[model samples]
Structures are given as structure tokens and as C-alpha cells.
Target: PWEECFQAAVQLALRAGQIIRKALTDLVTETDHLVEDLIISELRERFPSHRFIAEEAKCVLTHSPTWIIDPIDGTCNFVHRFPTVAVSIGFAVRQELEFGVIYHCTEERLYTGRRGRGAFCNGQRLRVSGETDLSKALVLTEIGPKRDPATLKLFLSNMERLLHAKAHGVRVIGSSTLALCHLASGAADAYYQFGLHCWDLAAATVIIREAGGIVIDTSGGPLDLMACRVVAASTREMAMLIAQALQTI
Candidate 1:
């Protein structure tokens, strides 16, 4: 069951998402800051007491409740009129993620999560796949815009190993939140990314956890919301297995 705050969060996030969706095609995607300000301002007014942390705007809410939002998770995709994009909102209390909702406007899919309450997609319950073997798991990864040669080499090394292992497949979706949601919904068996800011993964972290998934630091430690790297899997066993693979190579 959801509490009053949770319900309020759901409604507020959905409202914000709808606005973005309605304007997606018509709205000009010039400056990311413009869209960020629009959504942050609206959310700030709706929940005056809550603080907000977003990609374009970084503000600390001294209050008890705070929201982390990525107004446009796949801005590049949105800019290019690609169908893969979403508006992600995450609610946290006392610095802990409580719940999250990511709306894939193009497909009208709403992914939501309540801490310890499980995850859902358009009212249907979601659970990560039970695939434990790395060889059979389908994984998703992200390479940030940095394009550092060393980092690129490291990523390629890992990708080569996974391919050689006969993993089902690997995909790189520009949106971290969507990738995480895909893992929660069992559309992907695992997700790993580096250089992800707090706002990028905060909301989806709780959703993945609630959906019978595990997220860890690159070193396989417990996931710290403020950290910039993460490795997630549908199950604990799978998480460890992937962690081991990353460690060895």
C-alpha cells in the first residue's frame, strides 16, 4: 500500500510527465536548461516543502522530502525525434530513495516503484528475470559523452568478454533511467554504467530493488545513491556473477 506522500508523488510525477509528453513533438528542444527549468519550477511550486535535484538544476532541499528528476533522460534522442525517451522522477526522504516513476511518453508506459512495495508498469507488477548465468543474460550498458580513450578501451574490453561468453545480447540505450526500468520490467537481465550522476539513477535505483533486483557499486559494494557508477542485475546471484566478471577483466 502507498502512503499519502507516495500517492502525492505518483500524481505529481504523472502530471509532470504528461506535460512533457504532450509537448514532446511540438516543443522545441534547443537548450536542455529550458526544459529543466520548466519542470523543476512546476514541481517546486507543487511541493513547496520538497527539494529538487535534477540534471539541469541542482538545488538542495533543506526540508525532509526531496525529489530527483531528469526532465528528459534521453535528450539527444528527444532532440532527434527518436522514439526512445522518458521523463523520470524520484522521491526521496532523509536522503533515501522512496519511490520513482519514469514515463516513456512515446509508448505511454509508466514505470513506478515504492520502497519495499515492489515495482509496477502501467498497473502491472514487474520483476527482473531470474536468469543467473552471465552467459545467457541480456545486458545493457552506457558510454557517456566523455569519450575518453582510456575509458573507451576499458568499456570495449568488458564488452568483448561478454560477447565471447555468448551472452544473449548487449544494448546501449542513451537513457540510464530507461535502461534501469527495462531491467526492472525484465526486458533486460542486467545493466552497468559508469559516470552516472545521482540524478540519473536515484529514482530507478529504488525501482530496481523493489522489483527483485540488486544494484551495486562497480566494486560490488552496496549501491550509494550519490555515487557515479553502478552495476545492476535481476537477482543477487546474477549481480555477483557479473561483478566477478567485471573484476577479473
Candidate 2:
């Protein structure tokens, strides 16, 4: 028999994915926000004991086994027909992420992970890149909503340093969840995003970790869900190098 927790997560995530996929191609892009709310509500009703941490509201699911969801991670991309968005669902039991699922509607790829078990991308085992040096690494980044005047300056500073150090290149996919998924699947070596919320990092963090990657705060400390401001690569060495570079900015 399947573990009840994993089975519950799989059912909820797949159902949520069905809802998202059906809504995406329905010629009603404006309803994206409403769809998100609906998904949360359905989950709430279905599992009253389970609390939710969603992007639409600030409901604190301090209860055990909280569901952290990003109904649409790449909302801008989904709205603009960019086709890189995903629905992220994760279950955290007693503040520890127990399982996570990320579904890419456009590509029909489902990435799932559990705490002790390994991560999988569309049923295939996922693994992070073994590239140890920054020179051969492909890094992913994002520019957040509350853009500061110093944002460009900060990015430029990091870019110059990485380029000078001969890091391969940097790509911005405008999707944090997908970017992290790429990191988990070895498509990218590292990812860094600032000013992110709990819902955005909840699922991806577990996935990345299960895929043999490390994720840490900008200050090179443990990641706290509520006050998350920094997330970096999967390897400790890579994270340290990236964190050192970020600190200079």
C-alpha cells in the first residue's frame, strides 16, 4: 500500500494539475487569478484538517501538514502566452517538506519528490549536474516584482563578476518554480532569486534537495520559509561561491 501522505499528495497534485490544464486553454486567460482561488478553496473544502499557504492570501498554516501551493508560478508567462508556467504543490508536515509536485501544463511534464525518496521528472529519476566549477555552470536568475532602482546595478555587478570568472552564462526564465525544476533535472547548474515568498520556494526546495542539490539563504544560512529572501544552487561549494558573489552586491 502507498503511504497515506504520499498518496494524498499525489491525488491532490494531479487533481490540481487537471484543473489548471483545463483552465489554461479555455480561452479565458483573465480568469487565472480566480482559478487560483478556486483551487485553494477546493483543497480547503476537501481537506479541512490541512491548512494552506497560497500566493493569493496570507493564511498561516501553522498546523501540521500544511499545503504550500503556487497555483500559477509563471503567471506573467502564462498570461502572455509564454508557455513556461507551472502549478506547484507541496505538503509540509510539521514544518518539514514531506512531498512536492510541479506540473508544467504546456509540456505536460510532472516533477515530484518526497523527503527521503528521490525526485522524478515525468516518471524519470532526476539528478543535478556534477559540474563543480562556476566556469562551466549555467545559472538561472529572476528579477522580482518590487524592483528596486539598485536592481540593475546589483544584477550588473553579479554579472560582471561571473563573466569575469568565466561562468558559462546566465538565463532568466521569468519562472522561479520552473527554474528550480531545471536545476533539479540538470538543465541548469544553479538558480538564484530574491524577494520570493514561501509558496514560490516550498515545492522547488524539496525537489532540488531530493535531486541532490543544496538550497540556502542569501546569507549562507538555513532557509526559513516565512522570511525567505534568498535561494541558491544545490551544491554546498556552488552555493558558497554564489553567496560570496551575491554578498558583494
Candidate 3:
């Protein structure tokens, strides 16, 4: 049943959280090895046929099931002791997202989403906000690692557009998974990020959709897993508003 993989991922997230919590100030390379080694090895033994895509390794997706993961979602936050991080796992069968689980290590929360089932946080169901007015919406976003003058200007331009539209505010949490999870739970109204890999949003994509939100390519094109530029919103109006503004970038 689908529940097996979901539960396995839950336990793995828990185990990873304990390990990560103990090493919040660790170097990027060190924790990458610790979490990836433990997780990839365990998944290989538990489901030998599944493939994987995660940071610190290159995996070509096959016809079989694939697991996309982020050992530490907010490495910048983790390295700086900012505490906005998660161990995220996403399962796709034949390239379609099926299940997603994220553990917020410091906060000790577990979030899971299944394609047809629903989204949950710590055993409770998640329902997205109903706010539709862009002026009243809170947009969560990130500036990519690229800080070139042109890149910074484009990102700032989009942020200014959203602000001018009177969006409630813009917040940057450092962790993509946590941002999406927060959106799914109605804590925020929208999220956007460009130049992200599948590991960054693959799991959260399904989670947002299942929670009654809309996720689309922020760049005004179909989402490409390798370059997963995304915009997720709690309301149709907000989605359209954000997409319209971001298309300028």
C-alpha cells in the first residue's frame, strides 16, 4: 500500500531530525554526508527498486519509482543557527509526485501529503486560507544564491511589484519546504522562488495542491523538475496576481 512508503519516510525524517538537531552548526559538507549516507542507504535496502535524486549526488531518474530529497532544506539557516530547516522526502512513481513528508527538526513537527488523500501536520489535517485579495495576501519568497547585479535587480523588481500591489507583506524563511508547509497550513497566502532544483520543491508541490492551493511555474511556463521555478498561492486570484507580476523577471 502507499502507506508503507509514507510511514517509512516519516520515521526516516524523525531519525534525521535527531541527527541534524545535534549538529546545527556543522559544515555543509559534513551534514550532507551524514544525512545523505544514512537516508540513501536505508531507502536502498527498504525498497531496492526505487531510484533517488538528492543533494550531494547525481541520480538519473529511471522508469522505476524515484525519491527526491533534501537532507537539510535550509543549509544557510542551519549553518547560521537560524532554525528554519527540514529533512524533506518526496516520492514519485513514473515522474508523478505521489507522497511527501517533511520534518522540521528544531520545531519537531511532521508534515505529510498524499496525492489523493490530503495534507497533514502532526496528525491534524491542513486547510489552506481562503483569502483571495492580493492586497491582503502574504507572499513568501526567496532570492536565489546568485547575487549578481542583474539577478538582484530582477528579484527586487518582482518584490517591489508585489509590494506596490499592496500584498500584506513579503517574508523570507530560508527553507523552501517549511515555506510550502506553512502555506499549506494557512499560515501564509503564497510562495515563490526561482532557479530551484526538484529536491527543493518536488514534495511540497503535491503538498500544496492537496491542501487546496495552486502551484505553477513562476516563469510563465510548465515546471521543469531540474529548474523548478515555482509560485504557489492559496487563492486563484492571488496565484494569478503573483504569476502576472513575476513573469516580468
Candidate 4:
């Protein structure tokens, strides 16, 4: 059973959230390292055999039980005192996501998901908005910190196409985990992003899927964490619509 592991994840996320709050006046870089170390160390002690893939360090994903972490998913927002900062922890066994916990630290909203068990936020069940038409869907995206002209152009080009597709509205957020959580919670109907590492996704992928949404490659195939891009939506049709609208950059 994953209850104990899930409990550990939720508690660690809450503790990490406290740590993040205390460091509001500090360098986001330092806080990121601090929270990562805290979460990883605790999980290592609890599940010594687990592997890790996290934001603040170089690590690998493997077939063994793995814990993926983004200690502070919105470090940019954290630095600027934006309330969207989050602590994300995801667990997988044999490379299959088992459960996930995301703490919207500033807001103290805890999102938890267990494979086949459904997704929840603060004890409330989550469900996708069930919007299949891109023209009426509220889509979410993120433009990562990479500012190289090519990167900027590619990222913005996706946004341009989404707008042209006449999605009800397109919104950007600093936290990818939270953005996907929003999709799980029906706040947003679709999301896709470029340049996202596994840590940005491992947790929310389970959350979105367990909440009745679909997570796939930008090319509309099975998700590949190593590929560093994702397209998640309330329905397979919506996912296909998005995949068709975006450039495969």
C-alpha cells in the first residue's frame, strides 16, 4: 500500500512549505537548495532504496522506487513574493508514477494524487473541466527562463497558435505543477509547456491523470519524461487539438 509513502510525501511537502515561507526574504536559489535537501534527506532516510530526480541536483530516474522533487517549483515567483510558489513531490515504482503531493506553499493548498485512487486538493476531490473544444477551453502555459532568441520564439509561437485556435483564454503561470493542478481542479482545461524537466512534471502528471485528464507528449503520444515537454487536457480530443495546433519545438 502507498498510504505510508503518501503520508510521508504530504508531511514533507507541508514541512517544505514552512521552510519556504520562512525564507521569503532570502535568495530563492538558497531556498530551493534548502528545501530540496530537506525533502530528499527525509525521503532517503524513510525509503533508503529510493532514487531521486530533483531540481537542485543532478540525478537519474530508474526502475527502482523513485522520488521526483521540485522543492520550489516557482522559484522566480518565490523570489518576487508571488503566491504561486509550490513544493512538489512524486513517487514512482518501476518507473510508474504511484502517487504525488503538491503543496501550494504560500496558499497552503495541498494537492494529493494516488494512481487509480483519484486526485484531491485540501480533502476535496478534483475533476477536469471536461471541455473538449479548444475554442471554449481555458488553456495554460509557461514561458521558461530560457531567453535565447530561438527559445523565446519557439515558446511564443505555441502561444500564438493557441490564441489563433480561439481557446476561451490563455493564461501563463510561474509554476508548472500548479498549472497542471489547476487543470486537475477544473480551473483550467488544458496545459502544455516546453523545456520542462521531469521534476516539473512527475508529480502533476499523476495528479492530472488521476483526476480524469490525459497527459501526453506534445506530439500526442505517450508521455516521455526525458523529452522535457508535455500536453495535458481534460479530454483526449482536447489534447489532440492542442497537439495539432502547436509547433513541435
Candidate 5:
């Protein structure tokens, strides 16, 4: 059953968290690879026929059952012991997301989402803030690793207009996944990002959707996992509003 898969992922995420918390700052990269190996090897043992797409390696996604994993989602935060690190796991069947698990390691918070079921945080249900007005919405985004002049201009331009639009606020928290998790929990109303990988969004996509939020391509269309962009909000109106305001790079 999918529940077994979900449970296994939750346990793996927790174990990974323990390893992450104990890692020396200079060994962040080693821990990253070690954790990835640990996870993939275990999954292979238990789910022999399943496939994987993980951050530390390259693998193709097919219509078969597949797991998308981000062994450590906030490496920078982890390096500095910033307490925002997470392990994200997502499962798909027929090329559609079926369930997701994200463990906030330092804080010991677990988020899980199952298709047609619901999203949860530490056993409590989650839903969006229901903020439909852009001006009143607290927007969360990222100024990703690309710092080339053109990319910077596009990123700052989006932020400038959001400020101009008088959105309640705009923030960048360094961890795209947890930022979206906060959105799923109603702590933030909207989140958008460019240049993000599938592992960063896959788990959170299902989480946001099951939490009664909306997630779509930054162009205001259906999401494409490999497209490297997304806009997630509490409602379609909110998401579309942000999509219209963002400047494409």
C-alpha cells in the first residue's frame, strides 16, 4: 500500500535528519552524499522494483512508480546550523504525484500529504490562509543561486513590483521547500520561485494542493516538473495575480 511507502519515507527522513544534525559544518557535502546513498540503498532493498530520482544523482522519470528525493533541502542552512534543514520525499505513480513527506529535521516537524486525503503537520490537518487579495497577501519567493546580472535584474524586478503592488510583504527564507511548507500551513499566503528543481517542488506541490492551496506553473498554467519555475498560493486568484506580476527571466 502507498501508506507503507509513506511510512518508510517518513522514517528514512527522520533518520536522515539525525545524521544531518550531527554533521560537522565542513562535512556538509560529505553528509549530503552519504545521506543520499543511505536513502537510495535502503529504498532499493525494500522496494526493489521502484525507481528513484534524487538530487545527488541523475535518473529518468517514467510512468512507473518513482520516488523523487532531496536528501537535504537546506544545505546552506544546515552548514550554519540554521535550523531550517529538511528531508523531502515524494512518490509518484503513472507519472502523477501520489504522496509526499517532508521532515523539518532540526525542529522535528513532519509534513505528509496523500492524494485525495489531505496534508498534515505533525498529525494536524493543514489548509491555506484563503487570502485572495494580492495586496493583502504575504508573498514568499527566492533569489536563487544564479547571480548573473540579467538573472539578478529579473529577480529584483519581481520583488520591486511586489513591493509596488503593496503586497502585505515579500520574503526570502533560503529554503524553498520549507517556505512552501509554511504556505501550506497558512503561515504565508503565496510562494513563487524560478530555477528550482523537481525534488524541491514535487513533494511540496502535492502538499500545497492537498492543503487546499493552488500550485501552477509560473506562467499560470499546469505545472511541469522540469520547467524550474512555479507559483503556489492559497487560491487560483492569488496564484494568477502573482503570475501576472512576475517578470520572466
Candidate 6:
């Protein structure tokens, strides 16, 4: 059930967060691998029947109930000592995501959500921002890992259009999970990105929706947890706007 899975995710997130907090160092495969190993081992022991998958690596992935884990969602930020990094854990049954939990250790915040239950952060309920007008909204977006010069220019121009679209402003936090969390808590209006995988955004997708936000693909269609391309917003109107804005690229 989602309740059991949510509880397991919460405990593992906190436990993984502690490991991240203690090791504010670099993403040496040695260090990061150990962290992932610990988290994966714990989950495997707790839910032996479910498959396990991690962003940086995976071991028990299969065709049944799958548990997604990202030991640290923002390795870049973690290496640079920025606390925007996080741990995202999720559970899916028959390809449908059922629950998720994300932890930002530096902020001591816990974001959680289930299929039917509402989302919450630090024990307080979360709600997406209500501003629907693009002119008055703040959007969060990301430029994929320092790519080729030409590709980067296109990415920048795309962002510039959003800026020109009169979005109050657009910001990139280097951490998609944190940006999504901000949207869930009504601190931000929308989020768009092309740089993450299932493990990075799967758990947080649940939080965003349960918090009253909508997540769709760039084509303005339903976005599956496994779909890396995503457009998220405080409301359906804003989601469509962001999708259109991204399409201009």
C-alpha cells in the first residue's frame, strides 16, 4: 500500500540525508557509492519483494513494484558545497507511481505525498502558488549540464524568451528536486527541465501534484514519471503556458 511505502521512503530519506550532511565533500565515486550502497541496502532489506533502482546506479530493477532512489540529486551542488542537493525516493506499482518522499538535509525539510493523501513539507501542508498569469509568475528552469556552445546558446535564448514573456523572472537552482519543492510549497510558480532522469524527479512529481500543481510533458500531454522531459506549474493554465514557452525553442 502507499502508506507503507511512504513510511519506508520517509525513514530512508532522513537516514540518507544524514549521510549527505556529514559528507559535504566531493562526489568521489568512493564516497557517493558508499552513500548509495547504504541507502539501497536498507531499502532492499525493508522491501525485499520490490525492485530497486538508483540514478547513479541500479541493482534490483525489474518489472514489478520498483523503488527509485537518488542518493544525491545534485552532485554538482554537493561537490561545490551548495545545499540545494537532495535525496528523492519513490515507489511505483505496475508503472504507476504511488508515493514519494524528498529530503533536503541542509534545510531540514521533509516533503512527502501519496496517491490520494495531500502533500506536506516539515509537517505543514503545501499548496502551489495561485498566480496564473505569466506576467506575474516566477518560473524555475534548468539548462542541461554545460553542453556544446551552440546547444547552450539555444538554451539561453529559450530562457530569454521566458524572461521576455514577462514572467516575473526565471531562476535555475541547479537542483530540479528543490525547484519542484519550491513550486509545491507555493514559493515558485512553475518548473521546466530536460536534464533529469526518473530517479531525480519521480518522487517529487508526487509531491507537486498532491500539493495542487500539474506536471505535463513539453507537448502539453500527460507526463509519466519515467519521461525526463517535463513542464510543471502551479495550475493547469500556467502549465500550458510553460509548455508553449518551451516549445518555442
Candidate 6 C-alpha error for residue 35, in Å: 2.2
Kindly list the per-residue Cα lDDT of model 6 for residues 17-111, writing each as its tens digit: 88878877433645567768887887788778878777653333355888887888777888788778888887788776778798997988999
Model 6, residue 169: what's the lDDT?
A: 85
Model 2 stretches astray by more than 4 angstroms: 1-5, 19-23, 26-30, 57-63
Per-residue lDDT of model 1, residues 209-236, tens digit only: 8899998887677876556778999888
lDDT of 3 by residue, 42-83 (tens): 998989988888875244555578898998888888888898
**Candidate 6: misplaced stretches above 4 Å?**
56-63
Total clashes in model 2, counting residue pairs 3 or more apart in sequence or in different chains = 2
The local distance difference test score of model 1 is 0.77
**lDDT of all the models against the reference?**
0.77, 0.76, 0.83, 0.87, 0.86, 0.80
Better-scoring candidate (lDDT), 2 or 5: 5
TM-score for each of the candidates = 0.87, 0.88, 0.93, 0.96, 0.95, 0.92
lDDT of 3: 0.83
Which pairs of residues clash in candidate 2, taking residues 3 or more apart in a chain or in different chains?
213-234, 214-234
Best by lDDT: 4
Greater TM-score among 2 and 4 belongs to 4
lDDT of 5 by residue, 5-49 (tens): 888888888888788877733665888888889999998899998
lDDT of 2 by residue, 83-132 (tens): 78787888887767877888787888888888889999878999899667
Note each model's CA RMSD in angstroms: 3.1, 2.9, 1.9, 1.6, 1.7, 2.4
What is candidate 2's CA lDDT for residue 60? Answer: 57
lDDT of 6: 0.80
lDDT score of residue 243 within candidate 3 = 83
Model 1 spans > 4 angstroms off: 1-5, 30-35, 57-63, 247-249
RMSD of candidate 4 to the truth, in angstroms, is 1.6
Query: What ordering of candidates by TM-score runs from best to worst?
Result: 4, 5, 3, 6, 2, 1
lDDT of 2: 0.76
